[PDB]
Design a protein around this ligand. Sequence first.
Ligand SMILES: CC(=O)N[C@@H]1[C@@H](O[C@@H]2O[C@H](CO)[C@H](O)[C@H](O)[C@H]2O)[C@@H](O)[C@@H](CO)O[C@H]1O
Ligand SMILES: CC(=O)N[C@@H]1[C@@H](O[C@@H]2O[C@H](CO)[C@H](O)[C@H](O)[C@H]2O)[C@@H](O)[C@@H](CO)O[C@H]1O
Ligand SMILES: CC(=O)N[C@@H]1[C@@H](O[C@@H]2O[C@H](CO)[C@H](O)[C@H](O)[C@H]2O)[C@@H](O)[C@@H](CO)O[C@H]1O
Ligand SMILES: CC(=O)N[C@@H]1[C@@H](O[C@@H]2O[C@H](CO)[C@H](O)[C@H](O)[C@H]2O)[C@@H](O)[C@@H](CO)O[C@H]1O
Ligand SMILES: [Ca+2]
Ligand SMILES: [Ca+2]
Ligand SMILES: [Ca+2]
Ligand SMILES: [Ca+2]
Ligand SMILES: [Mn+2]
Ligand SMILES: [Mn+2]
Ligand SMILES: [Mn+2]
Ligand SMILES: [Mn+2]
Lengths: 232, 232, 232, 232
Amino acid sequence: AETVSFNFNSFSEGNPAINFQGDVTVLSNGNIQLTNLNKVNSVGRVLYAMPVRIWSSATGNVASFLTSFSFEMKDIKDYDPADGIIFFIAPEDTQIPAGSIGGGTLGVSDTKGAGHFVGVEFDTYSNSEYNDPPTDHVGIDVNSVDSVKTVPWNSVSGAVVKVTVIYDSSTKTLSVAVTNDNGDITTIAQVVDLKAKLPERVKFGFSASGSLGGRQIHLIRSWSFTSTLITT
Amino acid sequence: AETVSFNFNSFSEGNPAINFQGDVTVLSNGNIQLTNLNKVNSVGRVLYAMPVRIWSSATGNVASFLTSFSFEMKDIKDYDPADGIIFFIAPEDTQIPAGSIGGGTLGVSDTKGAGHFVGVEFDTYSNSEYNDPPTDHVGIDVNSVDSVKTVPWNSVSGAVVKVTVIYDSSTKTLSVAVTNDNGDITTIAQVVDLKAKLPERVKFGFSASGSLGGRQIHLIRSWSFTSTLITT
Amino acid sequence: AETVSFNFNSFSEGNPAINFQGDVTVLSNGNIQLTNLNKVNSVGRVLYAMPVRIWSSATGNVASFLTSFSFEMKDIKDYDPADGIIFFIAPEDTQIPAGSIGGGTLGVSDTKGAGHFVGVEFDTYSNSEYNDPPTDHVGIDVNSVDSVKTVPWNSVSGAVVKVTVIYDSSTKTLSVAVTNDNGDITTIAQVVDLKAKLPERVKFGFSASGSLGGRQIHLIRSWSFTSTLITT
Amino acid sequence: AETVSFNFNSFSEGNPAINFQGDVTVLSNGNIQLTNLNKVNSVGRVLYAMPVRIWSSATGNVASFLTSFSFEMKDIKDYDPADGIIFFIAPEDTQIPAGSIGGGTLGVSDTKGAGHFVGVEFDTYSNSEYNDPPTDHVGIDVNSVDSVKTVPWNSVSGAVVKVTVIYDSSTKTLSVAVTNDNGDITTIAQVVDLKAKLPERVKFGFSASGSLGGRQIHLIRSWSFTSTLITT
Ligand SMILES: CC(=O)N[C@@H]1[C@@H](O[C@@H]2O[C@H](CO)[C@H](O)[C@H](O)[C@H]2O)[C@@H](O)[C@@H](CO)O[C@H]1O
Ligand SMILES: CC(=O)N[C@@H]1[C@@H](O[C@@H]2O[C@H](CO)[C@H](O)[C@H](O)[C@H]2O)[C@@H](O)[C@@H](CO)O[C@H]1O
Ligand SMILES: CC(=O)N[C@@H]1[C@@H](O[C@@H]2O[C@H](CO)[C@H](O)[C@H](O)[C@H]2O)[C@@H](O)[C@@H](CO)O[C@H]1O
Ligand SMILES: CC(=O)N[C@@H]1[C@@H](O[C@@H]2O[C@H](CO)[C@H](O)[C@H](O)[C@H]2O)[C@@H](O)[C@@H](CO)O[C@H]1O
Ligand SMILES: [Ca+2]
Ligand SMILES: [Ca+2]
Ligand SMILES: [Ca+2]
Ligand SMILES: [Ca+2]
Ligand SMILES: [Mn+2]
Ligand SMILES: [Mn+2]
Ligand SMILES: [Mn+2]
Ligand SMILES: [Mn+2]
């Protein structure tokens, strides 16, 4: 089988295994801080450098994957804690949208909220223009921030959140298990057929954004990943 | 919400938080050895003492859970490596079947392979009588060892295997990710309605068995678990 | 050429191929537990029974060797995790020091920390009396536990650690590669002239010790070894 | 820390993690055949796609690495079993030398036998022009196929050879351990300062060449690699 696996316990600048796009900045403690607090409509994304081949056109096979990661959102004085983080999968040629307004677009879509990606968001601001739930929420997105499905959640400031995601090639199910600092778990699942939504090779990464009045610290702390494609 | 969570990094006898059934024994290193290598048709089961309320007849809600465990199977000289380990969920009054032949029944079913339980099996022997796959395999079982669904796998002697299981109340999906010692991952998923197959209160646990000529070391090294039931 | 090679994927009692000295005990899962958790100043050592000719007096030649093994140290409640395991080479007539205090001596030296051996230590406790570094470490020992050279390391409870050793006769260089469970590698290398420090025939083996209040589970799980001495 | 690791138990076409250069072809059994048996001065190289950061100009640190791999060379009728395989490390922009004559250049150097790389060769043909020992041999090359150091070896046709390499950043020691199918080991070592001979970012891989009358099957079967750079 064809397996891809990596494990970051801390990050550093100048590491060929990662692509930094936009306002991303590596902190002295090894954390990745996605957006710049002093910039309007700041967008910062981090991608794993090597493109992963999630499905084969010759075998028609799709990959299964297990990935776990932890992040932290923290309030800054005077600004609204917005907009949130998003773990996504997108074509290898993926780039931050031209003229991106950041904000509720999460750094991955256009003004209408359309884009070419699939991912799980942790939304801390309800954008009525994208049909956001009235509360913080975790969501599954397929080519749009107007979530296919969402589950009510609570973003605690300065709280380390651990997430685990499982994609099963057979059922084409994408499972997510979020563990809040207080101990409670929030799970959400949905059948998304990657073979039909994304090309053969893609790139995994995280993104975050802010607006003029919406800014908060968005931190990625660790990230392990393992995918396996049946080659036969 | 109503959450239940424990984490065993090592086990010990006389700990009131665990039930020992059958030939189970706790090794000096803190591991739990499920079967007795000297006994014919040995069956051993370890259960978390406190029953967990997976669903409510009052609210009709079903809980969601995240659990992670690791095990190790090892070959012993002269005997065939059989039969396997099974992570199961069963009524609080669950006991090893009367007159259990061990072997292909993994300690949870009768001779015909029927019983009242739901779980993930790691089968190292093909029992044609239970329509077993021709290879080692992981499988989802619902009230029988004639698996509802299986996926080819490979048991590596002396290799420490890691399992992540997530159950999403909403979509009733049970997702399993198995990370082999060589790095490769194996995922299997299936929709199972706990509310219709199991009572409000259940017990989580592990069970392994052997026959006369089928014996091997079945070890449980660690196990963390968290379930949350929405109470409203 | 003259080559000696063996491979233990699991051990057993009553195997004339191995020497058990002290509190050693072979677990039902085949692992070797070096110390007794209930004894004060427990010392346990295991040696490969047949002596290996590491150098010829006639030809002046020294043998090269490649050896690989895996262990596991696990904490036990109420006691400090000590003292560590040491892979050693010693005279065929080697035995545990008379009146051994266990502890910092690692079962291979006297109270001053002096003995006849060459080895690699995985020290989990800082013994000032032997100039131990302030943290966990891997060290190279030539006739003393006051390491010739050390490198910071981290012992993780219940984690299986793999180690690779290569000794090249020409450069008299002993290189060590430790693979922690988290993925990272810790290497350390040193020039040690075996011909001048040890006799023509030696015995390879492991050893671990504890004191009154310092005890932990020390396990050896597997061991492959090969050496070749040019005979011409 | 900064760790990079991968594990290839078999290879496959169209895999984004590998760069194929020259006459490389992936066989149905998942083996890589480096040279074309019907081509004069055939050359084939296969590299890991992601460039690895071996040292940091900011910290002045060098990484350490453990790598294990197996290969097989086989004789084809009428042609001389030539020329051998070489595991090398070169600058990320590395390519097959223009007008490479194959043969004793091993695909990594010009006609004079010079180039920019470091590596371990398994040379099956004595090229006087490069001061080749009169027998088959394993050697350490630093910017030239005129080995800095060699050790006599024997290449058995159709035999699967295992090789283990370790590089300790501290001593700057590159140690190799070769295991012949017959059981005997061949070790070789040498202090090479990578920080001085190679740039910050390099790519690892294997190369193989042949001439008009020198041809044989060069197969790569597996390859595991792990390197760690202290980031602080
Ligand atoms: C489209 C736009 O950028 N509007 C600005 C406001 O943006 C929203 O801000 C919230 C937080 O209040 C959140 O980040 C949301 O996604 C944004 O669309 C906000 O920045 C406001 C403060 O003056 O200015 C608006 O123009
Ligand atoms: C029904 C029964 O117990 N039959 C015995 C055999 O049991 C099978 O053994 C395999 C391993 O071969 C495996 O554990 C399977 O589940 C069992 O049904 C086996 O013990 C055999 C050896 O002599 O005796 C049969 O009577
Ligand atoms: C000399 C001696 O044996 N002292 C006892 C202590 O031993 C040290 O203990 C540490 C762990 O705390 C470690 O083993 C070290 O190698 C030993 O020197 C320790 O056992 C202590 C607990 O009460 O009693 C001392 O007297
Ligand atoms: C420089 C060159 O290409 N010479 C040809 C010979 O090449 C050598 O062949 C041996 C095996 O005989 C080996 O590969 C060596 O590295 C090569 O240089 C050889 O092919 C010969 C047969 O007619 O022709 C030469 O010109
Ligand atoms: Ca939003
Ligand atoms: Ca079976
Ligand atoms: Ca010590
Ligand atoms: Ca040559
Ligand atoms: Mn949203
Ligand atoms: Mn089965
Ligand atoms: Mn020490
Ligand atoms: Mn040469």
